[PDB]
Curated annotation (Swiss-Prot), chain A:
The modification N6-acetyllysine is found at K168. Component of the mitochondrial large ribosomal subunit (mt-LSU). Mature mammalian 55S mitochondrial ribosomes consist of a small (28S) and a large (39S) subunit. The 28S small subunit contains a 12S ribosomal RNA (12S mt-rRNA) and 30 different proteins. The 39S large subunit contains a 16S rRNA (16S mt-rRNA), a copy of mitochondrial valine transfer RNA (mt-tRNA(Val)), which plays an integral structural role, and 52 different proteins. mL46 is located at the central protuberance. Keywords: Acetylation, Mitochondrion, Ribonucleoprotein, Ribosomal protein, Transit peptide. One of its GO terms (molecular function) is structural constituent of ribosome. It comes from the Eukaryota. This is Large ribosomal subunit protein mL46. GO terms for biological process: mitochondrial translation. It comes from Homo sapiens (Human). The chain holds residues 43 to 279 of 279 of the full protein. The keyword Acetylation applies. Belongs to the mitochondrion-specific ribosomal protein mL46 family.
UniProtKB/Swiss-Prot annotation, chain B:
Component of the mitochondrial large ribosomal subunit (mt-LSU). Mature mammalian 55S mitochondrial ribosomes consist of a small (28S) and a large (39S) subunit. The 28S small subunit contains a 12S ribosomal RNA (12S mt-rRNA) and 30 different proteins. The 39S large subunit contains a 16S rRNA (16S mt-rRNA), a copy of mitochondrial valine transfer RNA (mt-tRNA(Val)), which plays an integral structural role, and 52 different proteins. mL48 is located at the central protuberance. Interacts with OXA1L. Belongs to the mitochondrion-specific ribosomal protein mL48 family. This is Large ribosomal subunit protein mL48. The gene is MRPL48. It is found in: Mitochondrion. The lineage of its organism: Eukaryota, Metazoa, Chordata, Craniata, Vertebrata. It comes from the Eukaryota. GO terms for cellular component: mitochondrial inner membrane; mitochondrial large ribosomal subunit; mitochondrial ribosome; mitochondrion.
Curated annotation (Swiss-Prot), chain C:
It is found in: Mitochondrion. The chain holds residues 83 to 181 of 206 of the full protein. Ubiquitous. Belongs to the mitochondrion-specific ribosomal protein mL40 family. It comes from the Eukaryota. This is Large ribosomal subunit protein mL40. Component of the mitochondrial large ribosomal subunit (mt-LSU). Mature mammalian 55S mitochondrial ribosomes consist of a small (28S) and a large (39S) subunit. The 28S small subunit contains a 12S ribosomal RNA (12S mt-rRNA) and 30 different proteins. The 39S large subunit contains a 16S rRNA (16S mt-rRNA), a copy of mitochondrial valine transfer RNA (mt-tRNA(Val)), which plays an integral structural role, and 52 different proteins. mL40 binds to the major groove of the anticodon stem of mt-tRNA(Val) in the central protuberance.
UniProtKB/Swiss-Prot annotation, chain F:
Coiled coil: none annotated. The chain holds residues 34 to 78 of 128 of the full protein. Signal peptide: none annotated. This is Large ribosomal subunit protein mL55. It comes from Homo sapiens. Component of the mitochondrial large ribosomal subunit (mt-LSU). Mature mammalian 55S mitochondrial ribosomes consist of a small (28S) and a large (39S) subunit. The 28S small subunit contains a 12S ribosomal RNA (12S mt-rRNA) and 30 different proteins. The 39S large subunit contains a 16S rRNA (16S mt-rRNA), a copy of mitochondrial valine transfer RNA (mt-tRNA(Val)), which plays an integral structural role, and 52 different proteins. It is found in: Mitochondrion. Belongs to the mitochondrion-specific ribosomal protein mL55 family.
Length: 217, 131, 99, 192, 119, 45
RNA sequence: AGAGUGUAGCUUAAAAGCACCCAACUUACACUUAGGAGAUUCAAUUGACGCUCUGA
């Protein structure tokens, strides 16, 4: 055949932080809380407060907010592990503690006669394995990483070839479970990039049509 | 009438039906009955995602065998500085679906996974002994 | 042995007057109703986006078959397989603050 | 002994293989719409329509009337879309629609109904009352000129004659007062 | 005159001279007064610019009410004062149809036909 | 993307008002849960 | 560079009928009730903007 059997990976780290609520969404969140309050009943806290208020009224004629104050003081003490990792990372797009609400896909800098640009991790089909197998040896032919990841299943996810006798590109997909890249100063420029920043590295047919299968939702 | 061309214009029991475990398809493939377990600490947010999962399966033409709830577990956390308490509850809703083609799996999974809500876990299992 | 909390506990009895203020305002009724209209439009747009990404992703996997039957049949025989290693699938939803 | 059906059988092109993967009607209403569409289909068996319907000739009832008014569909549609945009842009209209306190002016509705689709509604009323059958022996004409006829009853009263309302001979003792919107140079003929 | 008696195992009944049939599609409301022949006497729909240019929406409770008023006017001018309305239970318990029947009744149309002088 | 079924209220006829509560895990991750008392913050040991 | 072309998701529909979305009901679905958002790529059959397909 006048083609070359090459597979690739789409290793995506899941979003860790919840996406922020848009203007429209927050109005409902307030509204839904309002109607939840307006249609509830039997709060033990509220009953303790009301009953103690009435018994104190009897005693004054002749508690619970202290607990509320204590709770608020402890909550004011506790600081939250912040999610402004744009400030925690400046613009280091190679680290995995960049944009936490969104989704990042791996992208490494390579060199080739056609294009010396970034590629999704590549492999060639040896005559004794599956293409899922080819992505799984990409996992071990990257640059010293403890990427532990799940593979979404045994089927392709993209076919974006070029002619130079043809690099048939067989984009697969996987999902990062827990792993991390060793050697933070990796000489191979691995960059962890979103679909919105994909246009800083991927120009046309063989690499920029990957927006078909990079799911930003 | 039987001798006439209009015989059986009133059949209806061949249009209705009345009287599968680890199903496969050989060369092609299709998974068996799979349970989408969806536990959470919030009964509210769990129920909501189970509703979303059911509605998306119905829009995706995946057969849904049944939506059933696994028993709520109330666990008590005691910390001391006897100990005090903070009673917590985990509620679990399961969407039992039947026919998912092995090619479609990736898509369905990616989509339920991406939309997972804050604090609800998705554990898709095969119905063997979970009863 | 199936018992659940879909039942209402007996505790709920006769103290529901924490909110005896069912009386809304005309402006509140308008604001709530209009917000719900805007919710309906929003969620229609969201389902449009989700249907679009469904169609795009399936398009690609069917294009896979296309350009796998252009080349070779044995690779396709494994591209259609129940890979019985990924099924027990777990993923915990996104948390509010990072660890 | 059996005889093969003379044509297509009713529930024949439904695939009985994937009965559980075929879509079902879950609504009595949806079944009813399909039922009535088949009911109006021609059919090669004996039918209530065959024994009770009116079997008029398919002579394709000859028009004997003045040609249809010519309109510009694009300009009319653009005007109507802009008018609906303004009506929906009015906030009080949305308030009235949501509170169910809106209303529709019947007089304006009737005037532009007389201008737009009143001719065809009158034609159908005449055909139901069997006036073409008995006046022109089947030929139909769209009434394209609104012929306003009333009877002077009392001193300040009129009993209009629209499309089949009852007028007593006491109210019809003298001649009616008629008005047809016309141009000069057009001669006409009125007949009762 | 004969009313078509029978058909007492199916629905709707055909024992009427005229009938109000209302068709609520997704976008429009159409109400027709139809003879038992299937010939249509008088009709009112939101598909007309006649009702469109005054309504906000063509599928609301206001739409059903206004179609009720306009057909009531067309029925009185066509001489149709009586007809049968054959509803479904959910149509009967819906609020759009209550406003339509009220519009016809208060516009003059009586929604029960007189009986046949069989003798 | 994690908003779709996130916007939701308690869809029961008789139910107690549940307070918006942050629950840290053990690795220090908070999640918005609903609890009977206004304790704005609950720790998991 | 050249061809199939061109009504919102679909229609040997002509501004329609279904699909679709949110609330109430339902564990949920479904039904039902109330609401909702929409289309004719542009100039007097061709002419010139957008998708797909083919090649360099």
């Amino acid at each position: 055949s006048p083609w070359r059997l090459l597979g690739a990976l789409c290793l995506q780290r899941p979003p860790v932080v919840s996406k922020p609520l848009t203007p429209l969404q927050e109005e409902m969140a307030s509204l839904l809380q309002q109607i939840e309050i307006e249609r509830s009943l039997y709060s033990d806290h509220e009953l303790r407060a009301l009953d103690e208020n009435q018994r104190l009224a009897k005693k004054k004629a002749d508690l619970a907010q202290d607990l509320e104050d204590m709770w608020e003081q402890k909550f004011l003490q506790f600081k939250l592990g912040a999610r402004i990792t744009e400030a925690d990372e400046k613009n280091d797009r190679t680290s995995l503690n960049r944009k936490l609400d969104r989704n990042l896909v791996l992208l490494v800098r390579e060199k080739f006669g056609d294009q010396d640009v970034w590629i999704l991790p590549q492999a060639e089909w040896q005559p004794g394995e599956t293409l899922r197998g080819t992505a799984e040896r990409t996992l071990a032919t990257l640059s010293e990483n403890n990427m532990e990841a799940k593979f979404l299943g045994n089927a392709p996810c993209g076919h974006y070839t070029f002619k130079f006798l043809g690099a048939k590109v067989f984009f697969f997909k996987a999902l990062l479970l827990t792993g991390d890249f060793s050697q933070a100063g990796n000489k191979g420029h691995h960059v962890w990039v979103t679909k919105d920043e994909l246009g800083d590295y991927l120009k046309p047919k063989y690499l920029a049509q990957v927006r078909r299968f990079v799911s930003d939702l | 009438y039987k001798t006439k061309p209009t015989h059986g214009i009133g059949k209806y029991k061949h249009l209705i039906k009345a009287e599968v475990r680890a199903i496969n398809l050989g060369t092609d493939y299709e998974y068996g009955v799979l349970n989408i377990h969806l536990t959470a600490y919030d009964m509210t947010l769990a129920e909501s995602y189970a509703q979303y999962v059911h509605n998306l399966c119905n829009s995706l033409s995946i057969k849904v065998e049944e939506s059933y709830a696994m028993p709520t577990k109330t666990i008590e956390v005691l910390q001391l500085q006897m100990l005090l308490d903070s009673v917590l509850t985990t509620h679990e809703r399961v969407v039992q679906i039947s026919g998912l083609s092995a090619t479609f799996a990736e898509i369905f999974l990616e989509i339920i996974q991406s939309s997972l809500p804050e604090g609800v876990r998705l554990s898709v299992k095969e119905h063997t002994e979970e009863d | 042995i199936p018992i659940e909390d879909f039942i209402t506990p007996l505790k709920f009895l006769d103290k529901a007057r924490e909110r005896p203020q069912v009386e809304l305002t005309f402006e509140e009724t308008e604001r709530r109703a209009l917000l719900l209209k805007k919710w309906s439009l929003y969620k229609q747009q969201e389902r449009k986006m989700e249907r679009d990404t469904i169609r795009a992703m399936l398009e690609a996997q069917q294009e896979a078959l296309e350009e796998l039957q252009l080349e070779s049949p044995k690779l396709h025989a494994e591209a259609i397989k129940r890979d019985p290693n990924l099924f027990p699938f777990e993923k915990e939803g996104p948390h509010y603050t990072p660890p | 002994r059996r005889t093969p059906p003379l044509g297509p059988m009713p529930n024949s092109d439904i695939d009985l293989s994937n009965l559980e993967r075929l879509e079902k009607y879950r609504s009595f209403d949806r079944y009813r719409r399909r039922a009535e569409q088949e009911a109006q289909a021609p059919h090669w068996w004996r039918t209530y329509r065959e024994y009770f319907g009116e079997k008029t000739d398919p002579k394709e009832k000859i028009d004997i009337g003045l040609p249809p008014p010519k309109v510009s569909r694009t300009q009319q549609l653009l005007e109507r879309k802009q008018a609906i945009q303004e009506l929906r842009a009015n906030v009080e209209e949305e308030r009235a629609a949501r509170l169910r306190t809106a209303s529709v002016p019947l007089d304006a509705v009737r005037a532009e109904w007389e201008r737009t689709c009143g001719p065809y509604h009158k034609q159908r009323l005449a055909e139901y009352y069997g006036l073409y059958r008995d006046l022109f022996h089947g030929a139909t004409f769209v009434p394209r000129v609104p012929l306003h006829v009333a009877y002077a009853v009392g001193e300040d009263d009129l009993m209009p004659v629209y499309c089949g309302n009852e007028v007593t001979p006491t109210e019809a003792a003298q001649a009616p007062e008629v008005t047809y919107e016309a141009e000069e140079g057009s001669l006409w003929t009125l007949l009762l | 005159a004969r009313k078509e008696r029978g058909w007492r195992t199916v629905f709707p009944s055909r024992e009427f001279w005229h009938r109000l049939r209302v068709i609520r599609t997704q976008h429009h409301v159409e109400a027709l007064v139809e003879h038992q022949n299937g010939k249509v006497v008088v009709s009112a729909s939101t598909r007309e610019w006649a009702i469109k240019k005054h309504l906000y929406s063509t599928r609301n409770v206001v739409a059903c009410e206004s179609i009720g008023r306009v057909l009531a006017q067309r029925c009185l001018e066509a001489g149709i004062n009586f007809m049968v309305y054959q509803p479904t239970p959910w149509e009967a318990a819906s609020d759009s149809m209550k406003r339509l029947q009220s519009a016809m009744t208060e516009g003059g149309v009586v929604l029960r036909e007189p009986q046949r002088i069989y003798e | 993307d994690s908003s779709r079924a996130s916007l939701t209220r308690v869809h029961r006829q008789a139910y107690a008002r549940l307070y918006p509560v942050l629950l840290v895990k053990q690795d220090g991750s908070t999640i918005h849960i609903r609890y009977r008392e206004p304790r704005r913050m609950l720790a998991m040991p």
